[PDB]
Amino acid sequence: GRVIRGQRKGAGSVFRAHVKHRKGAARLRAVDFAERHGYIKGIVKDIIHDPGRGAPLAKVVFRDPYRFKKRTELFIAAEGIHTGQFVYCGKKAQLNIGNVLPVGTMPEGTIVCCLEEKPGDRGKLARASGNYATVISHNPETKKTRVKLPSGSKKVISSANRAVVGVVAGGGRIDKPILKAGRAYHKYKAKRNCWPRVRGVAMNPVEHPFGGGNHQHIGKPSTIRRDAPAGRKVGLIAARRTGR
Amino acid sequence: TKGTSSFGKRRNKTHTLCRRCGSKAYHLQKSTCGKCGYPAKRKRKYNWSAKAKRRNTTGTGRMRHLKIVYRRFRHGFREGTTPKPK
Amino acid sequence: GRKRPVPKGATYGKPVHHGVNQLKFARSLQSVAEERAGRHCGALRVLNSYWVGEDSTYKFFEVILIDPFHKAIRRNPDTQWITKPVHKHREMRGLTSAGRKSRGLGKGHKFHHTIGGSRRAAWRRRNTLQLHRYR
RNA sequence: CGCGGGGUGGAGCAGCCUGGUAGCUCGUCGGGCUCAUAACCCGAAGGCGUCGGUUCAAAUCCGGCCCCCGCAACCA
RNA sequence: CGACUCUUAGCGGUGGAUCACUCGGCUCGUGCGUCGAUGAAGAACGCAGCUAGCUGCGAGAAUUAAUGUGAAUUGCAGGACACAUUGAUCAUCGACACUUCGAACGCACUUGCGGCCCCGGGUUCCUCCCGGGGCUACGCCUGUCUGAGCGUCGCU
RNA sequence: ACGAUCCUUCUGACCUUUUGGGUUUUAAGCAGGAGGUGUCAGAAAAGUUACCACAGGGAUAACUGGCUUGUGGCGGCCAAG
RNA sequence: AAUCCGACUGUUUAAUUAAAACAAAGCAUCGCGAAGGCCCGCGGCGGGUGUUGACGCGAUGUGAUUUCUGCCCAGUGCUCUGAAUGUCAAAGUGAAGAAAUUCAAUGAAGCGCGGGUAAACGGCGGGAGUAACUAUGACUCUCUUAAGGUAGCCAAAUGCCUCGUCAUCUAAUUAGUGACGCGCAUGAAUGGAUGAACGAGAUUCCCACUGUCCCUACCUACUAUCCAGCGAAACCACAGCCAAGGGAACGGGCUUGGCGGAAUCAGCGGGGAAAGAAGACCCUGUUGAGCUUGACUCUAGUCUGGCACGGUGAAGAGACAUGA
RNA sequence: UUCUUUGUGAAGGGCAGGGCGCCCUGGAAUGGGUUCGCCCCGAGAGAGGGGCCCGUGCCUUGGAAAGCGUCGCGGUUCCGGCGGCGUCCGGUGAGCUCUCGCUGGCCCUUGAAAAUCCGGGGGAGAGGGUGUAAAUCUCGCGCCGGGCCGUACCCAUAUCCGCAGCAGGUCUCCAAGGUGAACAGCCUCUGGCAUGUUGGAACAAUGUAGGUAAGGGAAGUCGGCAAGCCGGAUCCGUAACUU
RNA sequence: AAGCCUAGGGCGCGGGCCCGGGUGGAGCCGCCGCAGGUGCAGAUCUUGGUGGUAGUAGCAAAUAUUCAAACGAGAACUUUGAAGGCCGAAGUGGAGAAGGGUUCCAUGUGAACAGCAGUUGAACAUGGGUCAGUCGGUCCUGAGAGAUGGGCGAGCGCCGUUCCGAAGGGACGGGCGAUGGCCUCCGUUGCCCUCGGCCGAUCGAAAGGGAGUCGGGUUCAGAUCCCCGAAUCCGGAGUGGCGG
RNA sequence: GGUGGAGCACGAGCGCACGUGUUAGGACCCGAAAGAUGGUGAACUAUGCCUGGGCAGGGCGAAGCCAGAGGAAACUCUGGUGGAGGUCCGUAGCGGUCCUGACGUGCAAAUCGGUCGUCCGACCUGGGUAUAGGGGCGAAAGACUAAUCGAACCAUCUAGUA
RNA sequence: CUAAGGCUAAAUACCGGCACGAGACCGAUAGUCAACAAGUACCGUAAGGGAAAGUUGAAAAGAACUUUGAAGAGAGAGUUC
RNA sequence: CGCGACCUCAGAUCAGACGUGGCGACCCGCUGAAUUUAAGCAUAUUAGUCAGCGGAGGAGAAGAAACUAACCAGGAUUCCCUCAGUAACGGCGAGUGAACAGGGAAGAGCCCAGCGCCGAAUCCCCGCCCCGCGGCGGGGCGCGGGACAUGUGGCGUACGGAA
Ligand SMILES: [Zn+2]
């Protein structure tokens, strides 16, 4: 049999991301003296729209406290961020929407987004379009913090990392349905070639383990084990349950 | 429409004249040859094509330098001497 | 060792040649160090090499190189044999001690091959059927 | 081929690791209860797959055989 | 007789078989056994009075120089030479020369852009501009120069 | 009323070798029996192709034709009714 | 005016199949918090998703709206925990021997064991008793393997019997439509029933309309006809009039008869078992190829254990041993 | 009376004409201004007065010398000639095309980078001392130079690709008049051509492509296949079902 | 002589062979032995040539040609004049890009091609023809490609484009020393102090960005390119060439 | 005294040459579906990205807005404007349903005529670029991958075997 | 015997190249694909595929010249055995 | 807070040289199949062969025993004959398959580290003089530099050697 699709997505060159019209990477500030001990003030110049992403980006400009330049950043805009609003960044910064500050310092129960997983990689978690992270409890010894991720899983992370306070702007995106193939065609055209998904039953059996036969049926249990090889791990991957 | 009607839209080219082998085999898109392999330092040759090895071998071209070496070989590799004048 | 440079499976043939993981390279790893030293430095010639340490992922070797055109070796009668063009790239042909052991050559009943010029020459004489003029 | 376990009234489960009563349900013959039916409570059968031994004494701990399935195994 | 058709014979047509030739291949044997950064092999482009192809040659381009030999080359003109003069043509070739790409070497192949020195026009260096020449690739050895190190040290 | 080679197992000899000499364990032999090839003079062996291909066969089917007429259709002889 | 299918716009087998097929928005799942999920790569501190972070990525099944999605985990899968522990390789440990060697304990993952999961693959029968005619079964009991087809639907694109039976459509209907269900072998996201709009989709009937026909006829252009000029190709054992016979079981040649007369032109398709292609339907080959799996050997990948990289300190705990 | 022609480049200056989310006075409900639609306004509407940008439009130097249309001459000719004149006045249109500008709508689509140039913040620094300098994001004029390659023709029923002068295929610019909704179909002008690898003579059958048929109207055929009917516009009228 | 033809004479059962005639012009034959790439009717055999078919099918897609004259030996097809038509501005028109590469233009020929013909042609033989600071390429970068460092690989080499990197050779001002031109001044280079990043070599569009040329005339064939006349852009200038 | 042996029992072999027959080698000659190694192709076509170009005339009439009328408010009707559309007729363009027409040694190794679907967005297309063979790519037909695709072409193994 | 270091000509191979010699070899469909302007013409985008084609005569002495036809083509004449 | 040695690591259009690529019949080092046979086929066979990669030479490689032998012992390596189609390997099937000795062609042996002993007694480069310089060498002169004690040169290598 030939190489199935999806297996072909690992080689790329047709399935790579469409990063032409994208305006950059959505990352937080790098750690330094002003952020670790005090705070630094930034100005939101304008808000832009990133193609292929459901969340707007806030263009925040900081001044470098070492050499005379203005540093431009790519911040994911919280819901309630307007142009010209002063945005603070550091440990001593106060607590309001659109203000990134370390997780070990605010009281638990706040609503934060663009959460940093490991201390010093500029934010990784809960930043898609409207998701957020909630803090359960802190720990002064060992500097740990339990944060509830939007998937429902609770992860114990370090208290030295940070997140911007608030939810991601642009919530309720999946509330309105697509209503067309064309609006779905244009949605993934900015992202990557993955939209026209042909189901494997109608496909011929040389491109798929489920295809073939005179009737459109699977013929084998669709729940496949975790340690299955490539070209066979197709369907329900290591399903604990299958029904409702 | 895969036959005669499909031959009409053949306008652009893929190969041009190579500048090391001289044959029309330098691929434009890959920026490489393959009659001789221009960007590779070594000349491309293969022993499964014995006819292609003798198409461009040592004995084919001009010998603008090597035939002097063969001619100088039987004469003794002398230099700096002249035949005795009259 | 040496994993066979083929794609995922793709070892079409009889089930003997289906193994790609547990394959061992016929030449010693120390001879590879001599091979790579002369490949990068084609002007010099390798004499021999020796072991200076190893790790679970790496093996370290020190290879002695000789300038053929330096007047200290070029005017020394004991060491100007390497300046001859016969010893061009001994690491390529397996003439160093690390490459000599990989050829399986030596005296006596322990080998019974490499009994001509080399292992390839031993195979040649036993396979060329000698036809005389008179038979 | 070698590591295991299990076979029980006319039918389904114990009691076996520790020997001291072959037991519990369900089908049957009946007896009670309620004015009667139904439901319920009770008495009675009829049986430890097989051989031998250790033992005060065996279905029970042992060894060998008939009927099964769990595995791992395979050059006439 | 006719016209048409068949066979045979002569002669004339299509065709190039057979035969005899052969500056060519195949096989075996002998001697030697030699490429290149002082730029290999190969490729491109040009060169004759009339020159398309082959061969030869490289802006000195059907060959230059020297040696040997000695009256020609030639398809047609032409003109050198006196062969009583190193002298027409040939072979040898040991001197000189050898355009561009090409390991290809300033950067990439569009034949476009560079820089550092020297020289001549610009000028009488005072910067543009033009022309010519020499350099400017990687890997690596010895040595030289300038450096770096909260490496090991002494002087301070 | 039952089974060749090779392999394995067991049995037997004060049996031979175990490759420089000697001892032992082991191993290889010699002879006999067993462990089986039921396709039973003894390969180790699941399907599908209507996406199929190759070499063949009228040694061999799916038409017609050929012999025969079981069957079908048709026509007779006797005569219980 | 109706029936079926697909909701639709769109796409599809360039060169026989434009569709009811694919796709599609919607719906329902599965895995994954980044040393991760899926995948590529011979290889690497490699690469794509990822200029990404659960409103995301990757793999699925179904196919608009409305309504509903019933039962079954026995089987095959997937998944969960687990000293409650059968099996279990390498390495390590203990014992015997002069040693190779043998034995024993220990014994990971995975298989078994025990739960979960059917919008996972899938399946959804009998028998017996049983209602005041009969019939039937509202009810009760049993297996095989876990229940035995629930809501709905049909002689369907699905019914062998079949042209099932009834009504309508016709003067006449194996067609169509509307009902019955006993359904060889209907059926619920292998989705069932519908369903406004639409379809170069598949069928039935009605009006108009007509050479489809009754039943053919006539006209025009360009060919075909001839001439000036130029001019091939397929095919060709030889060639060519038939009846019967036999033959290798259908003759152009053989036999017996009929008989036959130069050279041709325009049609014509009866024959030449005409030509085009070593039949592809069938079989054989110890000839292959594509695909599948519960075929026989393997293997990439992946999980687990040991050795080395692999250092440091502190408690505890299991076995062995000493042992009252 | 029918047809042809009836004009001015780039570069600058001036003036029309558009646009401003530019400014000054002033403060408005009895709300006002205003477009096809919108839309705007005490965060300043109207009303006045100014400012900026585009100015491809007109005039002006170019520039009437040249070009074009007529008429008449010179040179036998060989001549890039010599003269006469003219190249004018206006209006229109949902007119077609291009361009500029304003405004609106759509996106689970937000619609490119770099070379290069310019402006601003700053004042590190410079120059001169009472007639002169440094400066002149060069104000006007003046001098020199701008090096290398392609430039012919076809661009398609004959120069390309399809074995060919092959009814096939091949990416683009402009687009007259009439009829007509139309860049639909038909006719004509400018421009282009000889009917597409040949002509002549007849008008047989069978053909291919068009048509017509008295009466019936699908009785033909597997099957209304083909052919045929309706068809544009205006005024009425328009059912079942349905999301 | 070989070879070939033969209505001649013959021989041998036969394979074949010997003479006669004609063509031909240069080598050839018998016997004894030796050796082989040694004998053709087929293989849907290979190569080459030639027949019937056969002067046959055919030279029918897109409405259409006619008259007179000229050249010539020759005219249905060439040219001119007239008439009638068609393409009908989304053209059978006027220009380009890709591609073609002399096919573009003049003269001459009609041997071969233009499936008839041809006085004609994109056929042949002679010559000629493409002129740029302003039109494009050249410059920039996109999707991407691709070195160095680094890593991998037995290996040609492969991975990757900022990733395990001492990745700048640049610049202002000042100090030291020198030469150059009238070493007053300006200029040159070496060292020292000082400042310094920018994301990486490089390639990548004749439709992306990209400063700046238009009118008339002129050739058999080129013209925003040649001439005439009007401009415009860039770079330079030391003594600044002049004014403001 | 029995038994097995290719033995002895007063040799017969060696070398060379020829013929016949068998075997291995290409093996009397030609013939496959196949398999492997190394390279060449995205100028056709399949898809993604970048940079450009284009798509008459009309029909239906969504939001929003204006006016009038009816009323008791609630609010509702009427007449306008408006131009939204993976809308409709339809041209250029794209494609190929039907006549199973023409042709079918053709104009053509897939074209022509009429009749057709769509024609503002899942539209078409140029150039550049990326994906290369057990691989690519595929709105999924085992389609396309240079007239070749249920595994392209080129050369070798190979004169593969039958 | 003395490994984990090293050097060393000769007897050996040679279908490439240079210069030769020889043949119980083939003689232009044979012999190398190529006796000749052959890896040429030509074909495919490319990797690659890849031909056909020898002979006048001793010496061109290659037919001067007349005539028909425009000419290709003829009749004469002439050269050569 | 600096200077001066040493070690590691850089920049050079530094001074002077070196390697790249091609041919590739023969050779060396890897990598490396399937056709085919076994009347199938999977071990086997094809075959360490075709293909792929790197490297030189006129030859290459190998080469002077950690050898063969068990003999009354031979004695580097290379090639021929023979051993031999043998021992042996092999679904013990197909098939695969050496080596000793002997006769020949040729025949040549040696050098280091270490152990040690000698005043680094050694070597490379730059300047000057003489000779010849068209395969840049010999001798002399230079408190002229560098390498070298983290070891150069002489004696000296298993056949013993050194004093
Ligand atoms: Zn090349």
From Swiss-Prot, chain B:
GO MF, one example: zinc ion binding
InterPro entries: Ribosomal_eL37, Ribosomal_eL37/eL43, Ribosomal_eL37_CS, Ribosomal_zn-bd
Main localization of the protein described in the UniProt heading: cytoplasm
Keywords assigned: Acetylation, Cytoplasm, Metal-binding, Phosphoprotein, Ribonucleoprotein, Ribosomal protein, RNA-binding, rRNA-binding, Zinc, Zinc-finger
Zinc finger map (C4-type): 18-36
Locations listed in the record: Cytoplasm
Residues modified as N6-acetyllysine: 9
Keyword S-adenosyl-L-methionine on entry: no
GO cellular component: cytosolic large ribosomal subunit; synapse
Subunit structure comment from the entry: Component of the large ribosomal subunit.
Task of the protein: Component of the large ribosomal subunit. The ribosome is a large ribonucleoprotein complex responsible for the synthesis of proteins in the cell.
Family according to the record: Belongs to the eukaryotic ribosomal protein eL37 family.
Record protein name field: Large ribosomal subunit protein eL37
Gene name tied to this protein: RPL37
Swiss-Prot record, chain C:
Family to which this protein belongs: Belongs to the eukaryotic ribosomal protein eL15 family.
Keyword Cytoplasm: yes
Assembly and oligomerization: Component of the large ribosomal subunit. Interacts with IFIT1 (via TPR repeats 1-4).
Residues joined by cross-link Glycyl lysine isopeptide (Lys-Gly) (interchain with G-Cter in SUMO2): 14
GO cellular component terms listed in the entry, alphabetical order: cytosolic large ribosomal subunit
Subcellular location: Cytoplasm
Statement: the UniProt record of this protein carries the keyword DNA-binding: no
Function: Component of the large ribosomal subunit. The ribosome is a large ribonucleoprotein complex responsible for the synthesis of proteins in the cell.
GO MF annotations, alphabetized: RNA binding; structural constituent of ribosome
Protein encoded by which gene: RPL15
Composition-biased stretches (Basic residues): 100-113
Name of the protein described by the UniProt record: Large ribosomal subunit protein eL15
Record-listed Phosphoserine modification sites: 28, 31
Region (Disordered): 96-117
Biological process according to GO: cytoplasmic translation
Keywords assigned: Cytoplasm, Isopeptide bond, Lipoprotein, Myristate, Phosphoprotein, Ribonucleoprotein, Ribosomal protein, Ubl conjugation
